[PDB]
């Protein structure tokens, strides 16, 4: 209420506060105290500071066991004491901004709202299928090629199955720890929730789901798969990230494909991953471009890059591609990251990385691996290229790595399978304009033999495909020679691969 | 009342049918409905990117309250939309804004908890009525938010939240973060198939469903600025505007997908449009039209011809740039002129290209010239050269001129560029290089090529000079290159044809000046026989043409001797060249 | 009424013929008319380096509304130039900018979408002390305001592309700086008004020499 | 014009500048021009830098000879022309 008639309301109370004739119990924040009171230091002494520490997990458990019955009587549901101890423990582990017991009560109360909404209308999967069948109903109405009425028939059948099963049980009217974990996995993003059977069947086939995109390379697919299975099962070291890997080998063996296949598995898109191309980081300033500017400097109030983009979605994959192409002491930021999951940015708030999968591709032993992947067992190769890495890095940073793996030069059956994959995506690119493509098996032999050399991996297969198909084929498509509808066969001449129209 | 003066009823507008139909957004509406029916903190904030449908989730929630698709507990709730500007506007005295806000709080306590308040732009609430010593709307809604008396549905942006609401941590913890992700391609198709009826009712036209799947796919692929389903709706609506004007001017009546590609080609410049027959026959004559400026060197003309034919025919690898060429040859055989032939074909201009002159980059930090300086350092706010040059012009041609001069590790930036088509500047955003033609022009093996181009076939020449380049670059980097072409030294007849090209462009320029010039073949023979040596390329040719033509020619023009409208016969002397006026 | 306190009716001025006979720039007017007939985001922003005649484009739009060269959705509109410098005039107290601006927005809602607004120097609207983008921003979003913004290229990419919400509520119309021949056509269009004001004659070789020397010797 | 529920002078005359109904002539210091008129758009291109030179010593002599009669007829005194050139020279020499 200060104005031109400046009486400010801190001044009128102030002799009553100083003389003790007013018993004013104040309560304020800890930043707001410093920012608004300790400016005006004539009133900062009138008060006495009672500090209210953040409670422990066990004190939060003791708090929730007497608040429980009030939320029970509001939502008309029960809360079972495993959900209380799960709310306190999980909210202390997986939510880093808020503080106890605000987030514990938030998980409890929102879970009870979720159970009340189950009991009110109908359960979850009924609503999932109900929204999707009304979606496909309106979309099929608007489509008046389809390949859609199959999907609507499938979802309506599954809706009828779950509706009859719901009538057979006519459920959840308590709050178990499963509902707390569902509300935690919708708060933050970390899949803490219990694995429903489709996801568990998907996750036991991790290697089978990844070898549709990474052919060969068994050891690293195993390592990646074991890290994610430990994370979902609940055995990962809770004071470190999920998996801190270091990939090694020649050029074009699927390193960035293994990371893009991780992202396409786990988040259903290739470029949903914090990607730090470490080859911009050749000087010691890129430290500042990932942790941000310090106070006083230019990009302070715009943040860092690694810190902010992980703190948005705390469960993600981090790729540090071409990790040898950096200054050697950019890997001390990663010492903090890989040992404890904490990275303090410029502004002072510590982003938590204990749910991210840090992956570092490289090529540091390419000469050695290309020389000796034959006639050597995998353990001795890992040993000797780890000696090479010890010539590169410092023994701090490679002690923090969860597993160093070795990639190997691709054989000819590998390049046959890769040629099949690249041709499937070429069929997808040319089906959209309206062209159907087959291929002779003799022609695939020409692709596998014209795109093989041991030193460059599986990129010469890609540009051999590019030349020996895509240059005459796009030559003919622009020529108007190849009309859609008819199947474009890929047959060979004596050395060429010609397209025909029959 | 003090609500009707200052709020806007959304359920009344949904009942009147003014709102957009909201299709999709299942789990966002469901989690918001869960957070609204809590005991304490009935406060969902919808934190998402700008454009992804954060308001439309709230209006879809109002439409479900109208239709009855909500649970029984929310049937009949009045979604009121707060207006911060309507509160601040009439309050300049001490305590009029706070009076209005306390009146709103008393009415929303009076409404029996039957009101779901809504604030788009929650940060406007954060700094709302804050004057010198005034209770803003943050500090006055701050008690009635922690007790669930106010059922406020916020909405804010993902980066505006960091600026304004994480500044004030108590009002930051009043709200629950319901995150609204940018939708996928299929969901954008479904969202457009919902809203097709509204744009057809407005523009009085029809929209065909191939144009909708084309709008969603092309907007997801090419436009990097805005987001889904906003940019796809923009392509739909601007194409419908275009068809409505082309009906209404003086023909079509249904939006096709090529209309969507036209609006995309006008927004960006990437030629996604259908090939007209003039441009398609122009494009099949790629090699001949590059040999209308670059005679000689058939190989890379074939290579770049094939690359642009792939780019236009849709066979281009969409996770990579269009072509990533390396040019290797003796000095002065038209490498830079092959790139200028590219720019002159592609954009109908000569220096219409992003031209990095890599002999400036002889140390490790001109890397930082091309990307920019990080946070904290000097050239932060000015960006980078390459990143602004490509972000402002997506479909361009990048020339790394004279790429042998630099430090050996400037070409790691290019590892990112040539592998995935992306490059992160200092300010933390990536530029999409899925549309450029990255071209490098070295001369690492000009001694070897000038020595042994004779008696060695082209494949083994490429093999040998590529082995030398393998000694000079890293195996990671030559693996990324699309096609390492090799340039051959010029012959005599090639230099004669180059001189013919120079004379014809000189005659065209001086005809634009207003003159008419003829020449005898003997002058051409003298020009071909005087300035020949294979070691120096076609530049001694052009400077000999320069001297032995343009010194007497400009000597005689400036005297007024050459009257325009005559015939300038470039005859010869016993040893030199002189022009006459007959 | 708040419009008459702060707006300038351009079409009423072109009705009395005070404006310039804008000749050329036809495709930019056509793209602006494409933008102003959408459903949402009806708000073009004219963008180019300064001096190239963007207010001239909106004057030509107003003259086409007066003559009737517009489609059948713009006959009868009024083009009102808003003055962002005039709303931040008496900015003493709290909530006095918002009173003026809400008066303008209520009176524009009163006309039932009949008024094209022209907010020149659009970089003023971002920083107004929250302030001014956040009262226009929902009405800009729904397309019930038809704000023809007009700002410099560098001011646009410094002020408005920093702020993504206000950036997507507009639509760019890039204004190409005219050629030498187009400047000659402009001066041949505007020769008569200057010869009827100065009461002198102007020699057309001096016109084409003036355009050529101005393009050559001033950067 | 810092008023209440009202307008100032500048943003009420600003319509009359770009409407042709004002033949205004301004006068200001260079610095306040370079802050307050170069920053605006319409106020910039409705105004022209007629720069005023600080005059020379003999020009000041001519001006003082043009105004010697007024001050002499005012104060009933007489002014000497060597006193004029001494005053002008020492005023430009000493006063800052
Ligand atoms: N095992 C594989 N399965 C399928 N495609 C593969 C495989 N290995 C390589 N490729 C293809 O070859 C390309 C090159 O592989 P990348 O992983 O990108 O190279 P890299 O492994 O990153 O090695 P560097 O050192 O980064 S060049 C990939 O993008 C795929 O298109
Ligand atoms: N699920 C959806 N159903 C229908 N229309 C949608 C949907 N999502 C987005 N839209 C449309 O997308 C456009 C923009 O969405 P908006 O919510 O208005 O943007 P926004 O989410 O408000 O983000 P800001 O912060 O206002 S820029 C509108 O035309 C909406 O109708
Ligand atoms: N086939 C050709 N047709 C026309 N002009 C050509 C041809 N080959 C070379 N030239 C001329 O060669 C001259 C020099 O070409 P540039 O490409 O600029 O030199 P360069 O190829 O870059 O060699 P370096 O190593 O960079 S010095 C140009 O002025 C061209 O006119
Ligand atoms: N096509 C045109 N027809 C007629 N006059 C034009 C044309 N283009 C520009 N002009 C004139 O050029 C001048 C430019 O006027 P303005 O539009 O105010 O300037 P501008 O191009 O908008 O640049 P700014 O950023 O507003 S200073 C005026 O005298 C116009 O009459
Ligand atoms: Mg890689
Ligand atoms: Mg919004
Ligand atoms: Mg060159
Ligand atoms: Mg202007």
mmCIF file with all atom_site columns, C-alpha atoms and ligand atoms in Angstrom, chain B residues 335-337 355 401-402 441 539, ligand 7:
data_model
loop_
_atom_site.group_PDB
_atom_site.id
_atom_site.type_symbol
_atom_site.label_atom_id
_atom_site.label_alt_id
_atom_site.label_comp_id
_atom_site.label_asym_id
_atom_site.label_entity_id
_atom_site.label_seq_id
_atom_site.pdbx_PDB_ins_code
_atom_site.Cartn_x
_atom_site.Cartn_y
_atom_site.Cartn_z
_atom_site.occupancy
_atom_site.B_iso_or_equiv
_atom_site.pdbx_formal_charge
_atom_site.auth_seq_id
_atom_site.auth_comp_id
_atom_site.auth_asym_id
_atom_site.auth_atom_id
_atom_site.pdbx_PDB_model_num
ATOM   1 C  CA  . UNK B 1 335 ? 35.112 -26.559 -60.008 1.00 0.00 ? 335 UNK B CA  1
ATOM   2 C  CA  . UNK B 1 336 ? 33.854 -23.252 -58.654 1.00 0.00 ? 336 UNK B CA  1
ATOM   3 C  CA  . UNK B 1 337 ? 32.300 -22.769 -62.083 1.00 0.00 ? 337 UNK B CA  1
ATOM   4 C  CA  . UNK B 1 355 ? 29.834 -19.897 -50.072 1.00 0.00 ? 355 UNK B CA  1
ATOM   5 C  CA  . UNK B 1 401 ? 35.614 -23.379 -51.411 1.00 0.00 ? 401 UNK B CA  1
ATOM   6 C  CA  . UNK B 1 402 ? 39.241 -24.614 -51.544 1.00 0.00 ? 402 UNK B CA  1
ATOM   7 C  CA  . UNK B 1 441 ? 36.550 -28.320 -53.902 1.00 0.00 ? 441 UNK B CA  1
ATOM   8 C  CA  . UNK B 1 539 ? 42.625 -18.713 -66.553 1.00 0.00 ? 539 UNK B CA  1
HETATM 9 MG MG1 . LIG E 2 .   ? 37.701 -22.651 -56.760 1.00 0.00 ? 7   LIG E MG1 1
#
